[PDB]
Design a protein around this ligand. Structure first.
Ligand SMILES: Nc1ncnc2c1ncn2[C@@H]1O[C@H](COP(=O)(O)OP(=O)(O)OP(=O)(O)O)[C@@H](O)[C@H]1O
Ligand SMILES: Nc1ncnc2c1ncn2[C@@H]1O[C@H](COP(=O)(O)OP(=O)(O)O)[C@@H](O)[C@H]1O
Ligand SMILES: [Fe+2]
Ligand SMILES: [K+]
Ligand SMILES: [Mg+2]
Length: 566
């Protein structure tokens, strides 16, 4: 079957994306923000993402067997807004506007329960017959957690936790409270390592062997003036945090900066001041999730764990789950957050139509790519001088080895929040100054945020405690003896790293470049951070890449077969 999965809707929505499954294979998959250049794909149907999916596969909406949406949207409208007003035809017009998506007739429209869609995005793509499913995000239609059993192509729900007890809202609210912002929970995670935990309950959580309790909030509390429990949980957490924590909420400051010529936003306090709150929030999330995972694993009798939902992006928590006595194998897709429910809704529907879903296979490179002619066109636009190296991979290897920062734009854009050698900024993993150089001089990131490494899968065994595939940079692990000293720029406060393992199959060019690199610095490892300026999404087009390259004190840009220098 050909099934187009969708996320994103014009009203109060985030992380719009589109995914096209052809006979269980990912034909194309991209996030709206990459095309709009507006981070998080807020309040929109995934118009551009779906246009790309169809163009990539050479299809039109008339060639689709089904369109799948990753939430039970009619149900949310019925419950929270007094009725679902749209015929399937009218819903399609909104999701896939006719001026961009001409169609003779309407494809069958399927609405998939949000957490099922999450679950589908992990199970069906993991390459594992069966396992325990843990879904933890902000909130689906009603629930914030789902425990389920996956076996023989079926996902069966054992239990859910109501939205008011959301661990994602919780973590988001703490992230907002510190000044990092509720849209930047990943930063809270990186700040945790720098602080100290004293009471991992925050006088709110009570932990047990199957999970947690939030005696702070009535679990059946509900916003009658909205369609999720964000605002209710926000008021409760903010009041509680202010009550028990020495610092009041950090405030946002909007002021004209005559240096930028603009009103810029900042924080009244340095978020680094809240490092103990971050540590404590991180510890509480871990503890709560450990209980949930132990619980679903035991109730199912499985020892393989599938995790998805937005909290699933907590790589630190993931790494620690992996090493838990109760877990032998773990799969967490690069698209754990809502970006992944388009793909999940599509799989659920495809499987329902009799298809078998192929494993992801250690790659996330499903977005657009660009030919040499298309790249050259973008280069000539700018009038920049460039070369076409005989051995680009070797030249990049050498640049990196000498302490230079190289933009790397090749092949099909990766999907999800991590760059994985399709749209990356590259630098020495071996340099004890590279990290401060990129944070402070290049990207204006907070000095306390860590960077992460890409390395060959064939030496990952010797570099890292664990010998597993880490294709997605969605898990932290410990660095073996005594590489922990050899790789200063990609190590975090606690000797953990958040690695990408690379196989020749998954990324030949990148694999080859790392190989060359190894001959020069001994180790086929590099620093790999995402290719973007501070506000914007990861660069997608060759034009995006040039623009960002012009704006950053980077040394070179390797885009397609071409090398551009500063
Ligand atoms: N080994 C590690 N241990 C703990 N945290 C880590 C580790 N490696 C990376 N991180 C954190 O993961 C975060 C990812 O968060 P997030 O996705 O919000 O950043 P980003 O979107 O890449 O940043 P930007 O604002 O530049 O787009 C990093 O900012 C860093 O704080
Ligand atoms: N690194 C992280 N650690 C913990 N929670 C995270 C992290 N990244 C994202 N989240 C959580 O994901 C939640 C939203 O997840 P998602 O499933 O994408 O949306 P929704 O909750 O609307 O379905 C947010 O509440 C956020 O706190
Ligand atoms: Fe979700
Ligand atoms: K283990
Ligand atoms: Mg980044």
């Amino acid at each position: 079957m050909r099934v187009l999965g969708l996320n994103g809707w014009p009203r109060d929505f985030h992380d719009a994306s589109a995914a096209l499954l052809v006979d269980g294979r990912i034909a194309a998959f991209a996030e709206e923000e990459r095309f709009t250049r507006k981070k998080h794909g807020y309040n929109t149907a995934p118009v551009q993402a779906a246009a790309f999916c169809l163009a990539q596969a050479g299809l039109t909406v008339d060639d689709l067997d089904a369109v799948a949406f990753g939430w039970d949207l009619p149900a949310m409208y019925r419950e929270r807004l007094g009725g679902w007003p749209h015929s399937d035809s009218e819903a399609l017009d909104i999701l896939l506007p006719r001026d961009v998506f001409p169609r003779r007739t309407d494809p069958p429209l399927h609405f998939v329960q949000h957490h099922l869609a999450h679950a589908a995005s992990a199970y069906y793509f993991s390459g594992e017959d069966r396992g325990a499913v843990l879904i933890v995000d902000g909130q689906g239609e009603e629930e914030c957690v789902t425990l389920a059993h996956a076996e023989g192509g079926k996902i069966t729900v054992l239990d859910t936790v109501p939205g008011a007890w959301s661990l994602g809202f919780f973590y988001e609210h703490v992230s907002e409270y510190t000044g990092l912002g509720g849209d930047n929970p990943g930063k809270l995670m990186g700040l945790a390592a720098h602080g100290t935990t004293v009471d991992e309950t925050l006088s709110a959580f009570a932990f047990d062997s199957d999970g947690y309790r939030l005696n702070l909030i009535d679990p059946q509390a509900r916003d009658p003036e909205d369609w999720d429990e964000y605002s209710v949980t926000e008021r409760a957490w903010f009041a509680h945090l202010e009550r028990i924590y020495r610092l009041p909420p950090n405030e946002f400051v909007r002021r004209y900066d005559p240096a930028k010529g603009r009103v810029v936003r900042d924080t009244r306090r340095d978020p680094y001041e809240y490092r103990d709150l971050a540590a404590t929030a991180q510890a509480a999330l871990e503890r709560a999730v450990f209980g949930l995972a132990d619980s679903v694993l035991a109730r199912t009798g499985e020892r393989t764990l599938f995790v998805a939902g937005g909290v699933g992006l907590n790589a630190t928590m993931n790494g620690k789950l992996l090493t838990r006595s109760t877990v032998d194998k773990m799969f967490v897709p690069p698209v754990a957050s809502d970006i992944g429910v388009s793909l999940g809704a599509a799989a659920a529907v495809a499987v329902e139509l009799g298809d078998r879903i192929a494993p992801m296979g250690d790659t996330a490179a499903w977005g657009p790519e660009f030919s040499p002619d298309q790249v050259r066109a973008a280069l000539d636009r700018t009038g920049l001088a460039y070369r076409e190296p005989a051995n680009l991979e070797r030249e990049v290897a050498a640049l990196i080895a000498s302490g230079k920062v190289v933009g790397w734009a090749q092949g099909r854009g990766e999907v999800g929040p991590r760059a994985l050698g399709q749209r990356s900024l590259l630098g020495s993993a071996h340099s004890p100054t590279m990290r401060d150089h990129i944070n402070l001089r290049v990207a204006d990131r907070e000095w306390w945020r860590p960077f992460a490494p890409s390395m060959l899968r064939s030496v990952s065994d010797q570099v890292l405690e664990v010998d597993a595939d880490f294709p997605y940079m969605i898990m932290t692990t410990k660095v073996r003896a005594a590489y922990a000293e050899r790789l200063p720029s990609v190590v975090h406060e606690d000797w953990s790293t958040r690695p990408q393992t690379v196989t020749e199959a998954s990324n030949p060019r990148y694999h080859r470049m790392l190989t060359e690199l190894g001959d020069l610095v001994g180790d086929p490892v590099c620093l790999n951070t995402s290719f973007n300026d501070r506000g914007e999404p990861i660069v997608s087009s060759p034009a995006d890449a040039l623009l960002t390259f012009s704006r950053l004190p980077i040394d070179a840009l390797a885009v397609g077969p071409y090398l551009v220098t500063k």
